[PDB]
Homo-oligomer: A and B are copies of this chain.
Amino acid sequence: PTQLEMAMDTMIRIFHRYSGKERKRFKLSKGELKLLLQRELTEFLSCQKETQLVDKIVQDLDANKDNEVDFNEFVVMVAALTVACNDYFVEQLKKK
């Protein structure tokens, strides 16, 4: 497959790795989404404790842990979180 298709396959796979067995495909509960981020992003617990933005996103996932998210919302979150965590990692390199 092409590069785009292989990236898409990896993300759909990783999405449904955290899906409940009863849920409509391409949907997650916010609790499951939170577990996804803690396990599938680089040093997410470090990033989330030191960055107010990532912290407020994650605490909203806790408040509505049973509400469901679709694939679009998942893509919004991951893209925003990776951007915020990269700024955080880059700046930690200058502190180290």
Contact = CB atoms under 8 A, between A and B. Distances in A.
- The size bracket of the interface on A is 20 to 34
Interface in A62-81: 71-73, 75-76, 78-79
Nearest to A36: B4
Given A71-B79, A72-B76, A75-B75, A42 B7 contact: no
Taking the full assembly, how many copies of this chain does it contain? 2
Nearest to A13: B3
Given A72-B72, A75-B75, A79-B71, A41 B10 contact: no
Nearest to A14: B4
Interface of A: 1-12, 14, 26, 40-42, 71-73, 75-76, 78-79, 82-83, 86
